[PDB]
Design a protein around this nucleic acid. Structure first.
Lengths: 130, 136
RNA sequence: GCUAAUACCGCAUAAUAACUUUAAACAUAAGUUUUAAGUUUGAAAGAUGCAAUUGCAUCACUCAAAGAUGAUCCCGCGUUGUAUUAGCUAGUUGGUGAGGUAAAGGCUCACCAAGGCGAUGAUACAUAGCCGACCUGAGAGGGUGAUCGGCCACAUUGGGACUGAGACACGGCCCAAACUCCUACGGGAGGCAGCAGUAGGGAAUCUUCGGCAAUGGACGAAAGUCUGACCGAGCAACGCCGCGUGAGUGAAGAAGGUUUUCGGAUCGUAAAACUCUGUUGGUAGAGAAGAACGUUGGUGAGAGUGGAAAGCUCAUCAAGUGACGGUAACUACCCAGAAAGGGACGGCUAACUACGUGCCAGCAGCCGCGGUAAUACGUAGGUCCCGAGCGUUGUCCGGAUUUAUUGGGCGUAAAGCGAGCGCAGGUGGUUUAUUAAGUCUGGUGUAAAAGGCAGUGGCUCAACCAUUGUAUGCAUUGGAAACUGGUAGACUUGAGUGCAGGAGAGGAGAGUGGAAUUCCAUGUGUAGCGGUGAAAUGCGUAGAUAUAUGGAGGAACACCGGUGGCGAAAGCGGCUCUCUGGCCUGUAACUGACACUGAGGCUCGAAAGCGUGGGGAGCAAACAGGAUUAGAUACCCUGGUAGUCCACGCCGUAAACGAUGAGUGCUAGAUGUAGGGAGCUAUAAGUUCUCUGUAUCGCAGCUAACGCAAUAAGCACUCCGCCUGGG
RNA sequence: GAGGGCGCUUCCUAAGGUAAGACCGAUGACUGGGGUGAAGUCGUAACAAGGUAGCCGUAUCGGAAGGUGCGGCUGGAUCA
RNA sequence: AAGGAACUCGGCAAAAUAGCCCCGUAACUUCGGGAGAAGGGGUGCUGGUGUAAAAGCCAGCCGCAGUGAAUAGGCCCAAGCAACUGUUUAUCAAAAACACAGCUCUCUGCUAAACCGCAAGGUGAUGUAUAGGGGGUGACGCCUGCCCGGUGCUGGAAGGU
């Protein structure tokens, strides 16, 4: 249902890249703008755009591929399910894929990255790895 | 696997059966359903070695002792080895042992016990079935 | 009868103790807090002494002035299983009063009020000392509570209660009971769950040993005293460590064993010899381990104690600090001489040939074996792993992800309720701001400890002990608005409600029509018809079937009818009415998240059957007759009861199916067909998009395979449910 | 005179009896099912369209495998 | 006394319990009952205070005894039969006998059938098949199997008589 646009959206990204196609979709939030923002900054998609007047505005996003439409994103998932707001510490925020994976956590400051979540002693909700 | 379902759910288990139903042996005060502090033996009694028919196609004949059990259980457990010296009203040790070829058993008998003699220099341990290291 | 008191006791003297007061800063439902008037009562006038500005030390009541210790109870937190552990509770639950207490407190008790708990587990039953800790698992954890430390509880059993500051008290009392002893029978006495030790019972004896120096406590001014606490000695290979019984040279297969295809092969560095050596022990034993501090006296310092006295504080010396004791250690080290065995060999994991066997006796955790040469067994040799321990079972952990939070599955292999609701409960479209509740940061609590990560010393070095840190929701308090929750706020962009469309076997009643079956008469004629592979079954000459008609009645309504529709399914098809849901197409007209669910509870619901009352054509359980064959209680035939149908109540179980839960999101296409919306193709034709439908193939994905795949067995999340090897 | 033990009844009251259970174990003439072993005997079923394919829920008749019937599904055939 | 049913075929008779209040109450059940189950307690008077509408309180006084006597259930377990209430031989027998609702079958379309009377007349009943008459059985629960040879009954007519 509508109750998880986060993993609905990341699952939809797995439809876009696993189906090897151009554009995925997302209604208008601020959190998903931070999703394509942070992960576009980490080089995984190629667009940040949404429908210009809608509270359900379609964030339609071109992807950042490999060399032949090749995947970059493989193990895409939401960590914290809607049945479990994952509340971890700040001091030993763990590594992902021995460093080969992303990490994005809504800390008390904001929703920051892996090592910025590690050594700044900021902690919050674990969201998504690759 | 909902929120309440995965909280109702324990790490439960149901297959829990130690192979020794045991009143070993024991502390005979008045009531003797004292349980369980099990031995690998019995300082008890049995009566008579009987002969057991083995399975198909095991053409043999094996020696089970008519095991006294005060807890309403099998009058049998296996006597290993060739021959036996015991008789009725003899204290009989109780190996925890099972043979698929021997039907209706749960236990064996410790041969090579205080009431057991044998012939040593056995190629397995020289000293079971009532034997020792040979003093010549 | 009387002493004595380092007993008692009246009785002024003690009042911030409690209250009696008078004002209030304070004060919080209660309230807490300074002073503003009146009350109880003390001693071992003791003690050793000292001596003296004739007064100075150890103490009990004077009793406070606090700390300190050790307790008290209340609350938060987690602290077993059985809902085949449902209704439970009578002082129960409130209020008032009183007694008590160290205290609020049905803490009790009186009186007056009737609540309260509980299906999100209360009571009742089993079971349990609990925790730190500790074994195993990489961890997650599982598991244990041994021994150590803390708390709790107990003292043959049960119950009271005094004392004591403190007990309802292992070695107090009193009562009872149960044993036992003595009794001249009239009476008395006791409880090793204290350390021993005895008898029970087993796997489970520490010894019926010393002293308190090495502390620990108790009094005593000190001395002293006692302590089965502790320290030690002795029992247990019961565990952990550490060394070893020989080492070095010298190996030929050597004598030697065994196999043996007659060769070769053991002894593998004592090896057959040779050279030595003292681990542990031989003996002589030198020493013999410091196990050790002052309390007792002196000196000197301080309070310098009206006083130096005396004494007290504590800065010195003298002074015993024993039990392991000639104790570990060390010299002389004696001779290789006193001092290694246990398990295992079919694999399963490394170690097979002589080998009586002959499925024989036996061996075994699994596969198993043994019936003629068995590396299975008995059997010797060689080997494979270990050691003062080996192996065996008894328990537990792991593997086992074998309840899969980490770390499951549900189409068939175990599984989606038989389907609907709309109770809790769960989950939440977007956005504005607050909130910091949760969430992250800082301070605060944390096991006395003991224990890990390190280090130190040491019984050597060992092992482990002693030490020293480190490492911790044990906690409470500042910040963070990024998420959730909440609080207020907004929009529709989900849902639904509007206005237009249609559609259907959607339900429920009220009726109607025809064909067809069977039967009532019936024309008028003769054995017929039945059934199969055939007939007997049978009926029928009482002459009929069959054919001519009209009537009667029940049932059901061929093409319509279809991978068609509707309905959650169950299911629904002559025709016509009655009132009747449910979608979809468009639509923002409108609410502004009203959403999804769904345990519980509720409803509906195949098929029969069961209740009452009808209707009773055809069909057909039950049964009969005839084949059938050995037989036929079956398939066939002849029949033929229940039953099938109608109103009227029930079961709640079906291959419920698609052995495929519900919600919604995503997306190669080839494809069906409905009915709309829109275009569309125009001088009538015929095409394209859109929605719910239901196929068929097949992209990706996909599984054990089979297969699924837009109405996913693909990729996600919320509600539920199942599932743990078989009988 | 106060007060005092005794003087002096009551309260709670430990145990014992009572009654009417409930729970739980042991126990039991005969007896229902199930499993095991023989290799007796009865039988053709279930398995191929396994000899009437079945498989369910249900009623009902058999010594028994089983049958008859209500309705449903292939986990069913020659291929209908 | 003491002892109890040992007497007897048999606790037969007597005994003993019972009132009122207040507790409490098993079994199965057709869910009402059982059941007054059982078993238990109290019960007199004096003053209070609360009893008058109203018990309970407090204390005391007493008592052998407190519905002081009279009057007023013995209970329980189990089985068979019958359901029950009713009725039943007065001059014997009260029951398992009868009856009874119930259930079953059969007969009767009306001037009923059936019945009474020679008939007439009348009942049946101002009744109309849910009614009337006869037969069985006797609630409720389960169930009612087989055999039409014979008998009777019904119906049919071919033939014999």
């Amino acid at each position: 249902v509508m109750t998880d646009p986060i993993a609905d959206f990341l699952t939809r990204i797995r439809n876009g890249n696993m189906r090897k196609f151009d554009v995925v979709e997302a209604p208008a939030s601020k959190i998903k703008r931070q999703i394509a923002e942070i992960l576009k900054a980490e080089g995984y998609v190629k667009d940040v755009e949404y429908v210009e007047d809608n509270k359900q505005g379609v964030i339609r996003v071109f992807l950042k591929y490999g060399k032949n439409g090749e995947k970059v994103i493989t193990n895409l998932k939401r960590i914290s399910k809607p049945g479990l707001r994952v509340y971890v510490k700040s001091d030993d925020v763990p590594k992902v894929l021995n460093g080969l994976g992303t990490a994005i956590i809504s800390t008390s400051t904001g929703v920051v990255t892996d090592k910025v979540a590690r050594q700044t002693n900021v902690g919050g909700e674990v969201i998504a790895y690759i | 696997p909902t929120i309440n379902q995965l909280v109702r759910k324990p790490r439960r288990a149901q297959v829990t059966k130690s192979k020794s139903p045991a009143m070993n042996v024991g502390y005979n005060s008045r009531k003797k359903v004292q349980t369980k502090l099990a031995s690998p033996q019995k300082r008890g009694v049995a009566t008579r070695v009987g002969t057991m028919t083995p399975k198909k196609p095991n053409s043999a004949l094996r020696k089970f002792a008519r095991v006294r059990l005060s807890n309403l259980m099998e009058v049998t457990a296996y006597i290993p080895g060739i021959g036996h010296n015991l008789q009725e009203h003899s204290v009989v040790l109780l190996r925890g042992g099972r043979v698929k070829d021997l039907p209706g058993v749960r236990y064996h008998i410790v041969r090579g016990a205080l009431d057991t003699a044998g012939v040593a220099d056995r190629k397995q341990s020289r000293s079971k079935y009532g034997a020792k290291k040979p003093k010549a």
